[PDB]
Design an enzyme around this catalytic site. Structure first.
Site, PDB file in Angstrom:
ATOM      1  N   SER B 134     -52.358  41.245  21.594  1.00 52.98           N
ATOM      2  CA  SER B 134     -53.466  42.003  21.011  1.00 52.98           C
ATOM      3  C   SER B 134     -53.210  42.414  19.564  1.00 52.98           C
ATOM      4  CB  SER B 134     -53.780  43.243  21.855  1.00 52.98           C
ATOM      5  OG  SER B 134     -53.056  44.376  21.407  1.00 52.98           O
ATOM      6  N   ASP B 192     -45.702  45.720  16.829  1.00 53.23           N
ATOM      7  CA  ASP B 192     -46.435  44.506  17.164  1.00 53.23           C
ATOM      8  C   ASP B 192     -47.248  43.952  16.010  1.00 53.23           C
ATOM      9  OD1 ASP B 192     -47.269  45.147  20.673  1.00 53.23           O
ATOM     10  OD2 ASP B 192     -45.380  45.219  19.538  1.00 53.23           O
TER      11      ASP B 192
HETATM   12 MG   LIG Z   1     -49.904  44.241  21.388  1.00 52.27          MG
END
Ligand SMILES: [Mg+2]
Ligand SMILES: CC(C)=CCC/C(C)=C/CC/C(C)=C/CSP(=O)(O)OP(=O)(O)O
Ligand SMILES: CC(C)=CCC/C(C)=C/CC/C(C)=C/CSP(=O)(O)OP(=O)(O)O
Ligand SMILES: [Mg+2]
Lengths: 383, 383
Positions: B134, B192
């Site tokens: 994501s 991330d």
């Molecule tokens: Mg992520």
């Protein structure tokens, strides 16, 4: 001197926790393994001392006459140099007869006349797996001679079933056992013969030993992968990995040290009332010490295999000793399920391993009545 | 505003070292995983913004007219509450359209008139395996819109093959990417999206991030045991084991911290001249971190299995991320032997696993010419 036939037995040893970390000053826990060594002493009318080791299929014989006229005089105690000619053969277990003969003379010296004996030694202990078999052997030899020459009290002076020597007596047996270990190992620490004598558990750190006072009953599965290995080789490796990765390894060894400590504390709390939850703590300590040993680089395919099959049946394990092969320990707590452990043994055997269902935290030098002995040991010793 | 069709892609992430130890303040190394997410932006003549996610088989469509008359006003930014009605559906990937629509309005606000677009997102990244999909998705969305509204420079302003944004541009893409992550994860740390944007390797400790400057080329094997797991569950467990065994666990976490550190140092020394012996150091760091994670209690049968097969072919591995299932990393150094890795992949696949032969320390947000794209991604995106 005694005329009665003596039957003593000493257990083996296994490192519960602390294997390689002891070299680097950490604490380690050694425990009596209930795979005993049996020794049968029979007084002889003739004039010849004969030692018999069924396993190593050898049985030398000397005659009191000769030995009698030995100029006994009791770096390295060169006396061994002398003793070398005083007798005649040599080999692997060659020092074993040399340790004996040294225990025999040294101990029966005070005897107006060398007694004519007959010793039969047979052990359930696998040789060379680091289970301390030669200590158990030495302990058994020192116990039998001391008692024979009555240099130590006789546990079966009451015709009892099984007996043991009192503390001051045990300390002596252990003192002589150390001598025999010195002739065979030259530089033993005293843990093996100490475990073999007192039995139970032993704390060891930097030359300092202590017997854990209270200790619960522990059932395990001893597995010998029969995989050869070099002890000197593994220790060096760890020594290297330690030099190579100091900040990674230092904390790791501190971590193992904490496992032995924790364990010691838990064991002491189980000696009271063995709550089932406390066995869970041990299994975890065993899983963790096993992973840490793998981190130390002393693991082996045969060992990850033993552990994989074992966990496949819900049991926990860890190598014991040197690693890189050798033996493994599997905890068997109360509330088993025969089929589980039973499936494990064949599974383990299927891998070409030797598996025993014995126990840890065993007794120690014991004197037995030749009537309370298992038939296997019976036929073997000649009883 | 741009009229050209945009094609950006961002990589995923994997923890090389430091997985659970970061929660307890230790250092951790995250690295770009070359399983990219692709996004295709096509300007539209009509008046409808449409997002298409082939994977999650969903493609919602809004019309500029409606959105146009939105009372845009840019604890928790309640603006989301509004945006909730401003649109209409919901679900797992429901927040994904909500992150988009939020990126779209928030970014194209400064645009005299909401542009009519068409976005196509397709990734080689497995969803839910903790590979940061994501973030890569958000990074891809922020990159495409920013470039479209020319809020950021255009890497293919030279009709080149592959391009990237300059530092001050990347910092912006990452800033917006973090917003999208906030709407979907509410409390993301920024690793991330940071890994997805800058690519390469990332040092992370106590909120402080840094990009390892020099980094060598690393070939690995990504394996997804497809075994479900609870992240919250594992972390709690470690938290517990840590409370339960403080002196055993503290040094262990210090040991993992040392692995990430060592690794970081070694990587930097490989960026120079990758001597073969340095790959040996990494394999060892991977073996050790894997054992330590097992000591932490975050291992799993599927993972010991991945490692067992892997070592069975001479390769080294470790779980990555949460553990207790999920994915594993296998290092593939220069001087392989196809048959070895090839035997490994089927072996791995035989276990019912999904195995990829990708790489680590990957690029980062990149703009590609729709002509230099693989046919698979080609047919998939519609090129
Ligand atoms: Mg992520
Ligand atoms: C007949 C018989 C088997 C009993 C004699 C006992 C002896 C002298 C065996 C120990 C000799 C060995 C193989 C030492 C290393 S193993 P480790 O166990 O000392 O470590
Ligand atoms: C169509 C497609 C597959 C692209 C959209 C990308 C998105 C929104 C997927 C991530 C959502 C999930 C399953 C999160 C946890 S996995 P983790 O990787 O975040 O950890
Ligand atoms: Mg010994």
């Amino acid at each position: 001197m005694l005329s009665e036939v003596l039957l003593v037995s000493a257990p083996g040893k296994v490192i519960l926790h602390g294997e390689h970390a002891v070299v680097h000053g950490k604490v380690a826990l050694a425990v009596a393994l209930n795979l005993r060594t049996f020794l049968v002493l029979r007084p002889q009318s003739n004039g010849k001392v004969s030692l018999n080791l069924p396993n190593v299929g050898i049985k030398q014989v000397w005659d009191v006459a000769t030995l009698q006229l030995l100029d006994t005089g009791f770096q390295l105690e060169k006396l061994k140099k002398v003793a070398g000619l005083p007798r005649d053969c040599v080999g692997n277990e060659g020092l074993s007869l040399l340790a004996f003969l040294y225990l025999y003379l040294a101990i029966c010296r005070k005897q107006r006349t060398l007694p004519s004996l007959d010793i039969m030694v047979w052990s359930e202990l696998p040789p060379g797996a680091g289970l301390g078999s030669s200590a158990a052997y030495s302990v058994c030899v020192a116990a039998a001679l001391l008692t024979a020459c009555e240099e130590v009290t006789n546990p079966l002076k009451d015709r009892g079933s099984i007996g043991s020597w009192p503390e001051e007596d045990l300390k002596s047996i252990n003192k002589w056992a150390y001598e025999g270990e010195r002739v065979i190992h030259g530089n033993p620490s005293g843990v093996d013969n100490s475990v073999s004598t007192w039995g139970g558990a032993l704390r060891y750190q930097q030359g300092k030993m202590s017997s854990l006072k209270r200790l619960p009953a522990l059932q395990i599965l001893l597995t010998n992968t029969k995989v050869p290995r070099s002890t000197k080789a593994l220790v060096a490796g760890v020594r290297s990995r330690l030099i190579k990765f100091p900040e990674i390894m230092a904390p790791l060894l501190t971590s193992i040290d904490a496992i032995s400590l924790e364990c010691e504390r838990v064991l002491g709390e189980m000696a009271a009332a063995p709550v089932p939850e406390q066995y869970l703590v041990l299994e975890e300590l065993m899983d963790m010490n096993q992973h840490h040993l793998n981190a130390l680089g002393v693991g082996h395919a045969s060992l990850d295999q033993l552990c994989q099959v074992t966990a496949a049946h819900g049991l926990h394990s860890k190598l014991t000793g040197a690693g890189g092969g050798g033996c493994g320990i599997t905890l068997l707590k109360p509330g088993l399920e025969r089929a589980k452990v039973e499936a494990a043994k064949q599974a383990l055997t299927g891998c070409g391993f030797d598996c025993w269902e014995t126990s840890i935290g065993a007794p120690g030098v014991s004197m037995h009545s030749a009537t309370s002995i298992e038939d296997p040991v019976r036929q073997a010793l000649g009883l």
